[PDB]
Design a protein around this nucleic acid. Structure first.
Lengths: 156, 135
RNA sequence: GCCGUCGAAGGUGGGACAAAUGAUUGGGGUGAAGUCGUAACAAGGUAGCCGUAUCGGAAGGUGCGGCUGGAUCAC
RNA sequence: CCUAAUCAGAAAGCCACGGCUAACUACGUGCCAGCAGCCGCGGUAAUACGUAGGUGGCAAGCGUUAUCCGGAAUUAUUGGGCGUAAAGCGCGCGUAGGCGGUUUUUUAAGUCUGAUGUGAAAGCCCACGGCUCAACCGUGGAGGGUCAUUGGAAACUGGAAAACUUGAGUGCAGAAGAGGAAAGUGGAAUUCCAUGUGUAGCGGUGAAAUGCGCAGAGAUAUGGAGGAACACCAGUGGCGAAGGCGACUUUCUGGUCUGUAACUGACGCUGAUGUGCGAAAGCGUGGGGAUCAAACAGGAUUAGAUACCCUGGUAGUCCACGCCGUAAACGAUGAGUGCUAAGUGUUAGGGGGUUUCCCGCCCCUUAGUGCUGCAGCUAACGCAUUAAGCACUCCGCCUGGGGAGUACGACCGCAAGGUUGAAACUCAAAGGAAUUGACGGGGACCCGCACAAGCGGUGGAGCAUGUGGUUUAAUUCGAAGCAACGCGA
RNA sequence: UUAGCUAGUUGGUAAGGUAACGGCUUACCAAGGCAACGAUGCAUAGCCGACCUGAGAGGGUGAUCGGCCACACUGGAACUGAGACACGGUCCAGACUCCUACGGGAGGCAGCAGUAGGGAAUCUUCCGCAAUGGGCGAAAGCCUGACGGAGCAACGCCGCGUG
C-alpha cells in the first residue's frame, strides 16, 4: 500500500544518491491490470541527459532486483523530469523567470482562463512576461489572486 | 437485407480510425485551427526524457520521452536505437510506430538527422538511421 | 441645407447557451500521527446463468424472477 | 538534336538474405546488447547483434513514413450471416410502403425497340502521326445520358376494363381448448394465533452465541385468522405473438382447427414511423402483509462481525394504478409462401375400405408439435417436411476483442434511473466449434509373504568388513530410498 | 444524440420595382406555407468535368486543366457604366496598423515574385511579349506576375550508360 511504497521510497532513495547521487522527489505507481507503473521522478540536475536516465535506471533496477518486499514484480518508471513545474508557490514562479509559464486566472479571456507567456522578469504578483497569445506580444501583469491554476511551461 | 430496406439504407462499411493520431501542423500556427495534416514529419521538441523498465527475462531497458511537435500535443514516446547525444528539451523527429515495449504510446523517434543522432558504425544505416552511407 | 425611410458600425440594459473557472460545501480515502483502543484467538470459510433490487466500502451475499449454455490443459 | 575526337575510361548505388519473399555462410558477440512488420529470435553457437565474405533483389535511385483502394468479398447487389464465434423486438397491431393469384382485351406508361437531337474539349479506350524511342502531345475513331422526342410491341410489371376462384374473404357443418381479463367458490397449508394438554428446554453450532423460553418456548391436540399460491394432472397437452399462461367455476369475449368451397373476386403480403401488450425486482401513491425477504440488529465468529452459522424481524414481496417495458422474454432459429427420400409419433380432424363403434386396422391428406434419417448444408454441432435443403415479398441486428451498454445527449421516468447511447486507450488477438493429453477419488474384477497362518534375517552381546565421520604425514576414489553399507574392491 | 420549421411568410389585392418574375417590397385582407419520402438545425464543403486503386463492380479523390460558383482588411452602402455595388474604383464606419506639424492624415499580396513568420519544405522579389491573348484604336503601340520561355525541388514518369 501507500505505506509500503513509502518504505520502498526510503530504501531505494539510498541508491539514487549513492549511484547517480540523484534524489527522488517522489515515487508513485499507476496500474492498469498488470505490474503497476512506479514513476520515480529522479532529480539531481535539471537537464538530465537520456544516458543519465539509462544509467540511473540500471542502478535503481539492480537495487530493487534483489529488493522487492512487494510480492509481485512491477514496472519501474524511472523519470528524470525537466524544469516544467506546477507553480503553486511564489518561489516556483521566481525560479521560472527564465522559462515560459502558463496560468489559469479568475479573469479568463474567451471563456477559458489558461494563457501562456514567456517571463522577462519577476515582479511578485504582477507579471512582465512576453506573453504570446494569438501571435501577440505584450507584458501582461496576471494577478496571482486571479490565478486558479499555474504551471511552468515547456520552452519549446 | 430486403431490397427495399437495402434501398432505404446505405449498407455502411466499418471504416476504421487511424490509430496514429498524426494531426500534423495543418492550421495550428494560425487560428489554432484543428487540421488533419497527414505529414510524415513535423519539427518539434521532447521537453522531457525518461526510462521505463521492462520485465524479465529480456531486461532490454527501453527509454521514453515526452514530446511536442509543430502542433505541440503532449505524448510520452519511447526512444529506440543505440547511442544518442540529446537531452531534456532537445528537438526531435518522431515517426509513427507501435512496438511491444509499452502501451499508452504508438509513435517512435528516428535517429540520425536531429538531436537524437544515430550511429554510423553499422551498415544498416547506409540508407537509413538518418546517417549517411558509412564511408 | 434641414427633416423624414432604411442604415451599418457600435454600445447600453433583460436574460439563454454559456466557456475555463470556480464560492464553500460535499464524497472519499488516510494514519504519520493529537483521541486511546485493547492485547483474545484470530477468523467454526465459502462457492453450476441473466435481469433486477438490498446490503456488503467492496471483496460477495440475501435475494425476487425465471435458468440454456460453451470442466482443466500441456509441450 | 547532330557531327570531329576521349578512354573503359567520369557516371550507381541501395535494400534484403530465418522464413514469410529473392538471397547464407564464416566470424566476434552474448537473453545481454539488442534486432524487431509477423511468427519471435539473440543466453556466449545469431544466415534473427554486429562483422567479413557470398548471394539475391533492385538502380537513377533505394529504403522509411503519411494516406486510398486492391487484399479488403473486411458489406456480404455482384460479394455474410443470425443452429451455436457478432446479430431475431420480448412479443404485438397495424399507417405508408414493399411486392403482387388465374384468365380476357386495350395501354405503351413502363418494358423492350430502333430513329432523332443531344452528351464541351481534353483525358477517356482504339488506331494512328510526330517527337531516336520512350515519355509525350496530336489526329481521328471508339467510348461516353439514368436526357428529351418518335417508330413498333403488349410478354411482363404498371395501369384501364372484364370476369374466374382456393389463397383472402366468408359461407355451412362440426371438432378445440392453463387463451384472455373480471368475478366468485373450495382446499392442504407458510405464518400467526385462539383454546386445551404438556414438559424444559427450543434454539443454531465446532461449542453454540444469540434469539425464543419454564408464567407452558420448542410440542401437542382442538380452534381460527390473514394473506399466499394452488398436492396430482403436467406431457413435444394446450393457448399464445410473446411475456407468460395450470385449484374450481362463471364473465364475454379473443383465438384453435377438421371438413367447407358456399363464391364477391386478390379483396393479399410483411410491415419504417407510429404503436399496444407485456418475468421479476424496484418504486409513487393508497391498503394488506400470509409467508418470504434483503438490509438489519441480537449474534457465532472475531478488536470489528451485520461478514454465515444463528433469532426475530425486516423495504418490499402481497392488494389499486401508474412508474415501470426490463431479463436467460433464448431456439440469439422474424413472418408468410410453396417444393422436396424415408422411417416414424404426437395433438386435435376427416374419409375410405377394413370390422360389432376399425374405436378397434390401415391408409390419404388437414394443421401443427416429435425421435432416426435421403438429399442438401453447417468449421463442427445437426437439422432434415416442423429443414438449419430449396427458393420468394417484407423487419432488425450484426463491423475483432474488449474498451463501454458504459460514457453523453435527449426524451421519459415519482423515482429507480431508464430508454438511449460513445469517445478516447489498449491488445493482437478475442471467440467458436470440434481434436489429443492429463486430472480425480471410492467401490467392484483381481493377483503378490500382501496379508492370514506359521516361517525364516537385523541389532540383544561381541566380533570381521563395509557406509560415514574423526584425525592423519596420508588416512586415496567413485555411490548411495526403494535402485547405499564384503559396492567396484 | 438534427423534428418541427414557419409569418412577407402563404396567396391574392393595389402601388412601386427591376430584363422579367413575383412579397420582390410596400398597404390590404386571408391564413397560411413547409414537416419523417428527414423540413429544420448542426458540422463541413467550393462544383463538376475529371482523377487514383480496383478485373470490373466498386471505393476514394477533386493537384494544375475545362468551365460554373463564392470571395477580395471588415461591415454598410451607393456613382459609374451594356455590364461592377467594382482581386489591383469610391464613400462611410469599424477596427487594424502606420505616421504626422499630433491638430489628423495613410494603407489592406486569399494578384505575382519575394519578404517575415509559419510550416517538412515547395520553384526566380528571372525574363520576355519572341508566341498567342486581349484591352484601345486604323495601326504602330500601351500593359500582359495571362501566357511563352528559360530557373530551382533525382519532386514524377520515361529514356542513355555508370561498359
Amino acid at each position: 500500500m501507500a505505506s509500503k511504497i513509502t518504505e520502498q521510497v526510503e530504501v531505494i532513495v539510498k541508491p539514487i544518491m549513492e549511484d547517480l547521487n540523484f534524489e527522488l522527489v517522489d515515487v508513485e505507481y499507476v496500474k492498469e491490470g498488470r505490474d503497476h507503473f512506479l514513476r520515480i521522478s529522479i532529480d539531481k540536475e535539471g537537464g538530465v541527459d537520456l544516458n543519465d536516465c539509462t544509467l540511473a535506471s540500471e542502478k535503481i533496477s539492480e537495487a530493487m532486483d534483489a529488493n522487492d518486499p512487494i510480492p509481485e514484480m512491477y514496472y519501474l518508471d524511472v523519470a528524470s523530469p525537466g524544469a516544467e513545474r506546477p507553480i503553486k508557490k511564489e518561489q516556483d514562479f521566481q525560479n521560472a523567470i527564465t522559462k515560459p509559464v502558463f496560468v489559469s486566472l479568475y479573469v479568463p479571456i474567451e471563456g477559458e482562463k489558461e494563457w501562456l507567456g514567456i517571463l522577462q522578469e519577476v515582479n511578485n504578483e504582477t507579471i512582465v512576461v512576453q506573453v504570446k497569445i494569438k501571435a501577440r506580444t505584450k507584458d501582461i501583469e496576471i494577478p496571482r489572486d486571479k490565478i486558479a491554476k499555474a504551471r511552468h511551461a515547456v520552452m519549446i | 437485407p430486403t431490397i427495399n430496406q437495402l434501398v432505404r439504407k446505405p449498407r455502411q462499411s466499418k471504416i476504421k480510425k487511424s490509430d496514429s493520431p498524426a494531426l500534423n501542423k495543418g492550421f495550428n500556427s494560425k487560428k489554432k485551427k484543428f487540421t488533419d495534416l497527414n505529414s510524415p514529419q513535423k519539427r518539434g521538441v521532447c521537453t522531457r526524457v525518461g526510462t521505463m523498465t521492462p520485465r524479465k527475462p529480456n531486461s532490454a531497458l527501453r527509454k521514453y520521452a515526452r514530446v511536442r511537435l509543430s502542433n505541440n500535443i503532449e505524448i510520452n514516446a519511447y526512444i529506440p536505437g543505440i547511442g544518442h547525444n540529446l537531452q531534456e528539451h532537445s528537438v526531435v523527429l518522431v515517426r509513427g510506430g507501435r512496438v511491444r515495449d509499452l502501451p499508452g504510446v504508438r509513435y517512435h523517434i528516428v535517429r540520425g538527422a536531429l538531436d537524437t543522432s544515430g550511429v554510423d558504425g553499422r551498415r544498416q544505416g547506409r540508407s537509413l538511421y538518418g546517417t549517411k552511407k558509412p564511408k
